[PDB]
Design a protein around this motif. Structure first.
Motif, PDB file in Angstrom:
ATOM      1  N   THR A 275       0.838  -1.235   0.000  1.00 39.08           N
ATOM      2  CA  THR A 275       0.000   0.000   0.000  1.00 39.08           C
ATOM      3  C   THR A 275       0.858   1.263   0.000  1.00 39.08           C
ATOM      4  O   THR A 275       1.774   1.408   0.813  1.00 39.08           O
ATOM      5  N   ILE A 276       0.554   2.170  -0.921  1.00 39.43           N
ATOM      6  CA  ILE A 276       1.275   3.431  -1.036  1.00 39.43           C
ATOM      7  C   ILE A 276       0.265   4.548  -1.297  1.00 39.43           C
ATOM      8  O   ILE A 276      -0.537   4.470  -2.228  1.00 39.43           O
ATOM      9  N   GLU A 277       0.305   5.585  -0.468  1.00 40.40           N
ATOM     10  CA  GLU A 277      -0.627   6.696  -0.605  1.00 40.40           C
ATOM     11  C   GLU A 277       0.086   8.042  -0.533  1.00 40.40           C
ATOM     12  O   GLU A 277       1.300   8.102  -0.345  1.00 40.40           O
ATOM     13  N   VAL A 278      -0.674   9.120  -0.694  1.00 39.49           N
ATOM     14  CA  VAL A 278      -0.101  10.457  -0.619  1.00 39.49           C
ATOM     15  C   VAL A 278       0.331  10.657   0.831  1.00 39.49           C
ATOM     16  O   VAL A 278      -0.432  10.374   1.756  1.00 39.49           O
ATOM     17  N   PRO A 279       1.565  11.135   1.049  1.00 41.47           N
ATOM     18  CA  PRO A 279       2.069  11.355   2.407  1.00 41.47           C
ATOM     19  C   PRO A 279       1.470  12.569   3.113  1.00 41.47           C
ATOM     20  O   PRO A 279       0.780  13.381   2.499  1.00 41.47           O
ATOM     21  N   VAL A 280       1.751  12.677   4.408  1.00 44.13           N
ATOM     22  CA  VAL A 280       1.259  13.777   5.239  1.00 44.13           C
ATOM     23  C   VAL A 280       2.416  14.702   5.599  1.00 44.13           C
ATOM     24  O   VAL A 280       3.439  14.243   6.103  1.00 44.13           O
ATOM     25  N   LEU A 281       2.257  16.000   5.343  1.00 49.32           N
ATOM     26  CA  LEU A 281       3.316  16.957   5.660  1.00 49.32           C
ATOM     27  C   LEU A 281       3.328  17.166   7.166  1.00 49.32           C
ATOM     28  O   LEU A 281       2.300  17.480   7.762  1.00 49.32           O
ATOM     29  N   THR A 282       4.493  16.992   7.783  1.00 41.31           N
ATOM     30  CA  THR A 282       4.597  17.132   9.229  1.00 41.31           C
ATOM     31  C   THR A 282       5.938  17.676   9.690  1.00 41.31           C
ATOM     32  O   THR A 282       6.961  17.492   9.031  1.00 41.31           O
ATOM     33  N   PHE A 283       5.925  18.339  10.838  1.00 40.01           N
ATOM     34  CA  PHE A 283       7.150  18.831  11.449  1.00 40.01           C
ATOM     35  C   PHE A 283       7.338  17.844  12.594  1.00 40.01           C
ATOM     36  O   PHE A 283       6.425  17.659  13.396  1.00 40.01           O
ATOM     37  N   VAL A 284       8.496  17.196  12.661  1.00 36.76           N
ATOM     38  CA  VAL A 284       8.744  16.233  13.729  1.00 36.76           C
ATOM     39  C   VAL A 284      10.050  16.535  14.449  1.00 36.76           C
ATOM     40  O   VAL A 284      10.927  17.210  13.907  1.00 36.76           O
ATOM     41  N   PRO A 285      10.190  16.052  15.692  1.00 29.66           N
ATOM     42  CA  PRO A 285      11.425  16.299  16.440  1.00 29.66           C
ATOM     43  C   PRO A 285      12.582  15.612  15.725  1.00 29.66           C
ATOM     44  O   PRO A 285      12.380  14.621  15.023  1.00 29.66           O
TER      45      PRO A 285
END
Lengths: 114, 114
Positions: B1-11
């Motif tokens: 399964t491959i989908e559109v990713p989620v933009l995120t700011f992570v530590p």
């Protein structure tokens, strides 16, 4: 320890797990949590609302959702300067503006985990 | 399964771990892996180089680094259309341009894990 976060695109499975952990905040493009949103997992501190590749997201956030295990403080000026507003765990702000008691354009922030 | 990713700011601790896992790609603002960079962990597919809050990162990537356990295919047009270029595991492209055998502005991509 809290540092400037890293902008990343992650699979939904990864963001869903960071969401489950509870230390996060979602910034929406439109009022009432509508439109697209930027997801941030903590702890993290941002002196400016920017990102790599020319990302500049000042003047964009209209509504905010805070995770069940996070605390969010936004500042009116950049580099954590001047007036502040505190959003506790699970908090929802449907209209982020000065008229509603916040700021028209907050410019820096700190996301803590509780 | 491959989908559109989620933009995120992570530590940094989180992005460092996603980096350790090996299925990622780093897009740099300047040639030779200099300047700031956008980090993407896979698998993920992007029909357009955009993100929430008005993020539009077309015409920005000048160099690319592919993780040890990822494969990257970039397309010349959006929605995975027309010409493609393949960057295998660990690949480094110091100058992403048509003159160097790629595209001046790729507009969509697919990041696979191996």
């Amino acid at each position: 320890t809290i540092e400037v976060p890293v902008l990343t695109f992650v699979p939904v499975q990864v963001s869903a797990e960071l969401e489950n952990r509870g230390c996060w905040v979602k910034f929406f493009d439109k009022k009432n949590f509508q439109g697209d949103s930027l997801f941030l997992s903590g702890p993290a501190t941002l002196p400016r609302l920017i990102g790599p590749f020319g990302y500049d997201w000042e003047n964009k956030v209209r509504s905010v959702k805070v995770g069940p295990r996070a605390n969010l403080t936004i500042f009116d000026n950049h580099n954590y300067r001047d007036e502040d507003k505190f959003l506790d765990a699970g908090a929802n702000v449907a209209n982020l503006s000065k008229e509603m008691g916040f700021f028209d354009n907050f410019r820096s922030m700190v996301l803590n985990c509780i």
